[PDB]
Ligand binder design. Structure first.
Ligand SMILES: Cn1cccc1C(N)=O
Ligand SMILES: [Mg+2]
Ligand SMILES: [Zn+2]
Ligand SMILES: [Zn+2]
Ligand SMILES: [Zn+2]
Ligand SMILES: [Zn+2]
Lengths: 131, 285
C-alpha cells in the first residue's frame, strides 16, 4: 500500500542527513566527499519571462534561471526532519524557488548556502542589484 | 525505479501540489507534462493535509570523511565484543488515516529490558514534518496477540529515548567506550534507530576526555556513558547484522543449534538475547 516518493539514487544522502545532528553540515560534507547532489526535485516547465525574484507564489524564472517547487529544494522537507528556525516552519514549502541555471544541478545545496536580499527579493550574488 | 524510503502512506488518491511535494514523484498527475511539472493557477495548495511518511528503507552506506560508519565488519565487531548489545523491535501497523508502514511498539535489548512506546510516525504537513502519535494496530495474527495490551501501555518517545540512553550507559560505562547493536534482519531496527540515534563527526565528552556516545538536544552537548544523565540521544552507535553471516534458517533455529538455555518467550528482549548469544557462539567457537 502507499505511493513511493523517492528514487534509489537519493537513499544514501537522505539516510545520512536524516540521522545527522547537523543535517546542513552533513549535506555540505557529503558533497565535499564526492557525493551526488539530491535529485528528483520538482522542476517546472515555465515561460522563462518571469520577474526573476527568488521565492515566489507562482514560477517567476527569467532566461537565466530554472523554477522549482520550494519543498523539493529544502533539505529539511526532503529528509522529513525539523526545520532550524524557532517556529519550526518552512519558508520554501508552499512557494516556488528560482535557482540560477548554472546551479540547477543542486537546488537543495543552493538554497542551503545562499540568502535572499530582503530589499529587492533577488538572491545575493545572483541578481541582487543593490550594494 | 523507486524506493520504499519516505513512501507516502496516506489514503488520499491525489498527489501533492508542485510547491508542497517533496519530490517530482509525489506531485499530483494533473500537473505533470513532458517529464516536468506546470503551475496551474486556479488549482490551489492543500493547507490541511496530514501525510504519514515511511521511515522504512534507510541505507547507511555513506562514505564521508570524518564521519564514522554505523555498520561495521565482523572482525571489528569481534574486537569490540564488550560493546555488544542485542537489539530487536516488535512493531505495529499504521491504520485508519494511513496504511503501508510499521511503527516501533516494543524495543528489546539483550540486557532483558523491554520498552513500550506510543505508536509514533513522521507526518508531513503544509508547514513541516510533525513527529506525532498515529493510529496503529498490532500485526494480524495470534503470534502477536500479546501486543494488543501494549497498544495502551506505551510511553512517549521523549521518555523512551531517555530510558534507552540510561540503560545503555549503566550497562556499558565499565565495559566499552562504544555500543555495537547486534541485529538479525536489521531493517526495522534501523528504522527504530531514527527515533533515538544521532550521527556526526567523532566528539568528546563535555565533562571528560572519553569519546562521546550520547547527545542532548536540550543543551546541544555530548557525553560519554559516565556523564550522560538527562541525555536523550545515542550518538554515533555501531551495529552489525548477524543474519547476513550466511545463515539459512530463522533466528531461533540457528540460535538453537549452539544454545539450549534461551527458550523463545516470543518477546522483543528474547530475540535480542538470542541474537547476541548466536553472534557470540558463531564468532568465538
Ligand atoms: C505518486 N504519489 C506519491 C505520493 C502521493 C502520490 C499520489 N497519490 O499520486
Ligand atoms: Mg525481527
Ligand atoms: Zn522545508
Ligand atoms: Zn538586493
Ligand atoms: Zn565523560
Ligand atoms: Zn542462547
Amino acid at each position: 500500500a502507499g505511493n513511493a516518493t523517492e528514487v534509489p539514487a537519493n537513499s544514501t544522502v537522505l539516510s545520512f542527513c536524516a540521522f545527522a545532528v547537523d543535517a546542513a553540515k552533513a549535506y555540505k560534507d557529503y558533497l565535499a566527499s564526492g557525493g551526488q547532489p539530491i535529485t528528483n526535485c520538482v522542476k517546472m516547465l515555465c515561460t522563462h519571462t518571469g520577474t526573476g525574484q527568488a521565492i515566489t507564489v507562482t514560477p517567476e524564472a527569467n532566461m537565466d534561471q530554472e523554477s522549482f517547487g520550494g519543498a523539493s529544494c529544502c533539505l529539511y522537507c526532503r529528509c522529513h526532519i525539523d526545520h532550524p528556525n524557532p517556529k519550526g516552519f518552512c519558508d520554501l514549502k508552499g512557494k516556488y524557488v528560482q535557482i540560477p541555471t548554472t546551479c540547477a544541478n543542486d537546488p537543495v545545496g543552493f538554497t542551503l548556502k545562499n540568502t535572499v536580499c530582503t530589499v529587492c527579493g533577488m538572491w545575493k550574488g545572483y541578481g541582487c542589484s543593490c550594494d | 525505479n523507486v524506493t520504499g524510503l519516505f513512501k507516502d502512506c496516506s489514503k488520499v488518491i491525489t498527489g501533492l501540489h508542485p510547491t508542497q511535494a517533496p519530490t517530482h514523484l509525489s506531485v499530483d498527475t494533473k500537473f505533470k507534462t513532458e517529464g516536468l511539472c506546470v503551475d496551474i493557477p486556479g488549482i490551489p495548495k492543500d493547507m490541511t493535509y496530514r501525510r504519514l511518511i515511511s521511515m522504512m528503507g534507510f541505507k547507511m552506506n555513506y562514505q564521508v570523511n570524518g564521519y564514522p560508519n554505523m555498520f561495521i565488519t565482523r572482525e571489528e565487531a569481534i574486537r569490540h565484543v564488550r560493546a555488544w548489545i542485542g537489539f530487536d523491535v516488535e512493531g505495529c501497523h499504521a491504520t485508519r488515516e494511513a496504511v503501508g508502514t510499521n511503527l516501533p511498539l516494543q524495543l528489546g535489548f539483550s540486557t532483558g529490558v523491554n520498552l513500550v512506546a506510543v505508536p509514533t510516525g513522521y507526518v508531513d504537513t503544509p508547514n513541516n514534518t510533525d513527529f506525532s502519535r498515529v493510529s496503529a494496530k498490532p500485526p494480524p495474527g495470534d503470534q502477536f496477540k500479546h501486543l494488543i495490551p501494549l497498544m495502551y501501555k506505551g510511553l512517549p518517545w521523549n521518555v523512551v529515548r531517555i530510558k534507552i540512553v540510561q540503560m545503555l550507559s549503566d550497562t556499558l560505562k565499565n565495559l566499552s567506550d562504544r555500543v555495537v547493536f547486534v541485529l538479525w534482519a536489521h531493517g526495522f531496527e534501523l528504522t527504530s534507530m531514527k527515533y533515538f540515534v544521532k550521527i556526526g563527526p567523532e566528539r568528546t565528552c563535555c565533562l571528560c576526555d572519553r569519546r562521546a556516545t550520547c547527545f542532548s538536544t536540550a543543551s546541544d552537548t555530548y557525553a560519554c556513558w559516565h556523564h550522560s544523565i538527562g541525555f536523550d540521544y545515542v550518538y554515533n552507535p555501531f551495529m552489525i547484522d548477524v543474519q547476513q553471516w550466511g545463515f539459512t534458517g530463522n533466528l531461533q533455529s540457528n540460535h538453537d543449534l549452539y544454545c539450549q538455555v534461551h527458550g523463545n518467550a516470543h518477546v522483543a528482549s528474547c530475540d535480542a538475547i538470542m541474537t547476541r548469544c548466536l553472534a557470540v557462539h558463531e564468532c568465538f567457537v
